[PDB]
Amino acid sequence: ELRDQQEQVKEDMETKCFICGIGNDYFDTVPHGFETHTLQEHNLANYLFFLMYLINKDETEHTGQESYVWKMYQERCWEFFPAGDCFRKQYEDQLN
Amino acid sequence: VLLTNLSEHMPNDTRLQTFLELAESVLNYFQPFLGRIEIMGSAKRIERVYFEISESSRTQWEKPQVKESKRQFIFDVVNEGGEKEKMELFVNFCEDTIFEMQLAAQISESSILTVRSALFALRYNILTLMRMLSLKSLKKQMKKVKKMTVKDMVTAFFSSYWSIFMTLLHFVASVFRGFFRIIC
Amino acid sequence: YFEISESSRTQWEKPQVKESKRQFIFDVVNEGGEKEKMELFVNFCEDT
Amino acid sequence: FWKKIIAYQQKLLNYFARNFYNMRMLALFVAFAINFILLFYKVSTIAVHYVLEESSGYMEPTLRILAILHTVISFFCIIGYYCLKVPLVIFKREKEVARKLEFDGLYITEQPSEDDIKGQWDRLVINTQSFPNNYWDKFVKRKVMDKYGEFYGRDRISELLGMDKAALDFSDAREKKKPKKDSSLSAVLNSIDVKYQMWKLGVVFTDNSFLYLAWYMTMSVLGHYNNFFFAAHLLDIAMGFKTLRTILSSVTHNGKQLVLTVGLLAVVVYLYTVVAFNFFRKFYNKSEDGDTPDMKCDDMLTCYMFHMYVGVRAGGGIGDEIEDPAGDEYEIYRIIFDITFFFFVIVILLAIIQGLIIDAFG
Amino acid sequence: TMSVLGHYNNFFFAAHLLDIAMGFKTLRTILSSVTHNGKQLVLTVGLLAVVVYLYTVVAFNFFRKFYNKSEDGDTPDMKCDDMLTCYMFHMYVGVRAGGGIGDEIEDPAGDEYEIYRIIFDITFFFFVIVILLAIIQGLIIDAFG
Ligand SMILES: Nc1ncnc2c1ncn2[C@@H]1O[C@H](COP(=O)(O)OP(=O)(O)OP(=O)(O)O)[C@@H](O)[C@H]1O
Ligand SMILES: O=c1[nH]c(=O)c2nc[nH]c2[nH]1
Ligand SMILES: O=c1[nH]c(=O)c2nc[nH]c2[nH]1
Ligand SMILES: [Ca+2]
Ligand SMILES: [Zn+2]
């Protein structure tokens, strides 16, 4: 059971994206879709670097999105994270 | 950042495509430093966010201790991650890793022999193979292909492949001998 | 629509090609990639 | 006269390749026959002699006949699959290296070395006169020219790929063809590319199936030296049958985990040996007669040997073999010792290994 | 036919107790479990026979002196002076043994081939007793399941 839990932990990364949770097949409809979504669109390292950038940047120079994320991070409200949505998912209607 | 934002927000524009083509080197250089994410914007829409990622941050993220912490974090959240607790755990890990990177920056300041043996063994084996494919003996063996029949050629073909098999068995065996000698 | 030659049919029904096809199918179903699937398919087609 | 010999080897038609599977199963049947003959050997008496316990009066010469036939059939086997599948392997390797040269430019820019034996061997074949011998595209060299001439040095690429920079361009500029035929003397002799045959022989020697056939032939040869070497050929049925191949591959399927578990078993048995050496030494007498005591745990290496070989193989563990503890001062300590040994080694770790193998098979 | 032969010998009526296996559903499943993977079972048994034959070859060539199964010194009963006898002994005793052939053949301590025979017995126990027998048992159990 411990072995199968480790195997499921490994597999679940390829099945769904960590940040959004959308299944990998929707991305894979476009070739290399998962390899682009996990590395560029929704990347854990990218989110952590964004948080560090917000901390290092002065509050006066914060942009609109930066200030929004700063407020909700200080308030511990994690609604800014895309829950079940992505850029292409949201723009399938108009862009696509 | 401006060019990337424009390209990703208006994909269907050849006028912008020309600018991207002429700026391909700028974007290629900035790719390691450009960080792109998606957030739930205040306008009830998903919005792209572009920012700067420092080389020091990249190096301290690639540092091994941060990697092990990331592995433990990922294993734990996939096992016992909560319904809403998932991203709270994610941001707690992000804060811990930011402190870890700060500490790592503070702390940090400022086989093939067998392959070559096989190469040489094959080299001299093939040298021998061509040397008796080209010897004066085989250059003179053309009288038998005059008194040629079928038995002479059967013998010649069997002898040739038999010598090829001899060269093969000299090889592999020589590799094993050299490997044993070098390891002990 | 295209033409398939009788020689092609016979050499496809030949046993060695059959074994290569079995190995190809087993391998791709096990460890086939997301986009690599049809690249492996065309590589097998050229080899066959 | 010299339209002959070459076309004539071709009259051999690669018949070994045509009946390679038929010939392989003939070899397997001959191995069955030889190893069933071997079942009637017996020892007679100095130096013992292996003589056939035989009654029909026919089994002695047929042994030598079958050994010679098996050796000949296996040599024909190795000539086959070299007529048959070696060209396919060569074509696949040539295609792979050509695609790496063109799409990836591995030798133009990346220059992979020191880690990929395929990489260095393909580097060795890069500059051959006829590189795409089995590959369909005979113009890969000139395509690499057109792709990387202005970047990496036109002449540098020319000498890297080993082409003549002007041969074909003035060939297409002016026809100027001179007659040439292979029937001419020494033409066939000198028409062989040493570096290309180098690379072909190297890759086919690297090939796994060719190595297996080489081992089969070598043991078929050694069977004449000693007839019991023909017993190794019964393992060929394991590769012949699909389920037996799965059984064999089950061991390697979890090889890392199996090795680590065996190491853990060795470590825990070593700990038990340490404990027995320090405290329970007097219990390890394996002598029935009182005059000559045979201590198995007066030496560290001997104690480790005894614990492994006897305890791990034992149904209940080391306590079923070492002396009883009743009446001794360390009775409870030795009881705990034996119970824990049985629980951890026999019950858990051995079951862990067995379950690993069974689950890999499943 | 066996009911008829029961008059010839009353013990032939014992074969009719096997009818309950067909009468009951679960026993029918147990019987059909053997045939469910019959090809695979036969191939695995053949592999076991082949590996035991290899071990017999090795013992015949090298470890022959260890196969004395006689308590009295006057009459030695060698089980591996004949190839067929050695194969018989290895199958019948080693495969059935809990630890393998080494629990039954003479101890190797003090001999020149001590380490070689230790490897022989350990590999025999690992491959025959631990793996292949478990492979067959798991085949039958999984067919039933
Ligand atoms: N948000 C995400 N960020 C990164 N990878 C993700 C994400 N969501 C899913 N993945 C998947 O995780 C895998 C990347 O490997 P993983 O997340 O275990 O570690 P890593 O950061 O790539 O480092 P390493 O390979 O050194 O362990 C890929 O299969 C990728 O598709
Ligand atoms: O992890 C963190 N490190 C910091 O330095 C910091 N400053 C504000 N918020 C912070 N979080
Ligand atoms: O596999 C292949 N064989 C060929 O002969 C060929 N010619 C072009 N492309 C080819 N591919
Ligand atoms: Ca401001
Ligand atoms: Zn995502």
Residue carrying the six token digits 């030296």 = D225
Contact present, E95 and E52 (Cβ < 8 Å)? yes
**Structural tokens at position A12:** 């679940």
- Round to whole Å and give the CA distance between D8 and D67: 30
DSSP state of E80: S
Q: How many Å lie between the alpha carbon of C42 and the closest alpha carbon of chain A?
A: 16
- B120 CB under 6 A from ligand 2? no
Q: What angle do CA E98, E104, E107 make, to 5 degrees?
A: 120
**Structural tokens at position C17:** 């090609």
Instruction: Say how many C-beta atoms besides its own lie within 10 A of residue D26's C-beta.
Output: 16
Which residue, among E98, E138, E92, has the nearest Cα to D346 in the 3D structure? Answer: E98
In the stretch 13-52 of chain E, residues with CB closer than 8 A to chain D read 39-40, 43-44, 46-47, 50
Contact present, B36 and B53 (Cβ < 8 Å)? no
Contact present, D333 and D282 (Cβ < 8 Å)? no
Contact present, D247 and D111 (Cβ < 8 Å)? no
**E46, E53, E138 member nearest D362 (Cβ):** E138
Instruction: Say how many C-beta atoms besides its own lie within 10 A of residue B129's C-beta.
Output: 21
Helix H or strand E segment including B25: helix B24-30
DSSP state of A18: T
Q: Which residues contact D212 (CB under 8 A, 6 or more apart)?
A: D239
Contact present, B80 and A11 (Cβ < 8 Å)? no
Residues of D in contact with E125 (CB under 8 A): 313
**D21, D85, D95 member nearest C46 (Cβ):** D95
Residues of C in contact with D85 (CB under 8 A): 16
D14 HSE (CA, 13 A, CB side)? 13
- Round to whole Å and give the CA distance between B108 and C43: 48
Q: Which residues contact B56 (CB under 8 A, 6 or more apart)?
A: B105
Per-residue DSSP letters for E32-55? HHHHHTHHHHHHHHHHHHHHHHHH
End-to-end CA distance of chain E: 34
- Round to whole Å and give the CA distance between B135 and D194: 15
**Element counts in chain B: helices (H) and strands (E):** 9, 2
Q: At what angle do helices B85-107 and A44-56 cross, to 10 degrees?
A: 70
- Round to whole Å and give the CA distance between B98 and B95: 5
Residues of E in contact with D315 (CB under 8 A): 98-99
Q: Burial level of B82, CB count in 10 A (0-12/13-18/19+)?
A: exposed
Q: Burial level of D62, CB count in 10 A (0-12/13-18/19+)?
A: middle
- Round to whole Å and give the CA distance between D219 and D6: 32
**Structural tokens at position D160:** 């890297």
- Round to whole Å and give the CA distance between D241 and D247: 10
Residues of C in contact with D84 (CB under 8 A): 16
Chains E and B make contact, 3+ CB pairs within 8 Å: no
Residue D103 alpha carbon to ligand 2 centre in Å: 46
Instruction: Say how many C-beta atoms besides its own lie within 10 A of residue B26's C-beta.
Output: 11
- B91 CB under 6 A from ligand 2? no
Q: Burial level of B67, CB count in 10 A (0-12/13-18/19+)?
A: exposed
- Round to whole Å and give the CA distance between D248 and D251: 6
- Round to whole Å and give the CA distance between D273 and D280: 9
Contact E60 D228 (CB under 8 A): yes
Resolution (angstroms) stands at: 3.3
Q: Which residues contact D279 (CB under 8 A, 6 or more apart)?
A: D330, D333
End-to-end CA distance of chain C: 21
Q: At what angle do helices B112-133 and D194-206 cross, to 10 degrees?
A: 130
Alpha helix ranges (H) inside B47-111: 55-62, 64-80, 85-107
Q: Mapped to the 3 state alphabet, what secondary structure does D267-295 carry?
A: HHHHHHHHHHHHCCHHHCECCCCCCCCCE
Q: Mapped to the 3 state alphabet, what secondary structure does chain D carry?
A: CCCCCHHHHCCCCCHHHHCHHHHHHHHHHHHHHHHHHHHHEEEECCCCEEEECCCCCCHHHHHHHHHHHHHHHHHHHHHCCCCCCHHHHHHHHHHHHHHHHHHHCHHHHHCCCCCCHHHHHHHHHHCCCCCCCCCCCCCHHHHHHHHHHHHHCHHHHHHHHCCCCCHHHHHHHCCCCCCCCCCCCCHHHHCCCHHHHHHHHHHHHHCHHHHHHHHHHHHHHHHHHCHHHHHHHHHHHHHHCHHHHHHHHHHHHCHHHHHHHHHHHHHHHHHHHHHHHHCCHHHCECCCCCCCCCECCCCHHHHHHHHHHHHHCCCCCHHHCCCCCCCCCCHHHHHHHHHHHHHHHHHHHHHHHHHHHHHHHC
Contact present, D34 and D228 (Cβ < 8 Å)? no
Q: Which neighbouring-strand residues pair with D44?
A: D49
The SS3 assignment for B40 reads: strand
Chains B and A make contact, 3+ CB pairs within 8 Å: yes
Residue A17 alpha carbon to ligand 5 centre in Å: 4
Sign of the C-alpha dihedral computed for residues D127, D129, D134 and D138 taken in this order: positive
**Structural tokens at position B142:** 């053309």
Which residue, among B3, B9, B45, B57, has the nearest Cα to B28 in the 3D structure? Answer: B3
- Round to whole Å and give the CA distance between B97 and A11: 24
Helix H or strand E segment including B52: strand B46-52
Residue carrying the six token digits 């796994």 = D208
Residue carrying the six token digits 């491959």 = E127
The SS3 assignment for B39 reads: strand
Pick the residue whose CA is nearest to atom 5 on ligand 3. D136
Q: Which neighbouring-strand residues pair with B49?
A: B37
Which residue, among E102, E57, E97, has the nearest Cα to E80 in the 3D structure? Answer: E57
Which residue, among D95, D78, D98, has the nearest Cα to D86 in the 3D structure? Answer: D78
Pocket of ligand 1 (CB under 6 A): A 13-14, 17-19, 34, 38, 42-44; B 67, 74
Q: Burial level of E56, CB count in 10 A (0-12/13-18/19+)?
A: buried
- Round to whole Å and give the CA distance between B46 and A87: 6
- Asked if C35 is an interface residue toward chain A (Cβ–Cβ < 8 A), one would say yes
- Round to whole Å and give the CA distance between B50 and B31: 11
Contact present, D161 and D144 (Cβ < 8 Å)? yes
- Round to whole Å and give the CA distance between B166 and D217: 11
Residue carrying the six token digits 């101890």 = E107
- A55 CB under 6 A from ligand 2? yes
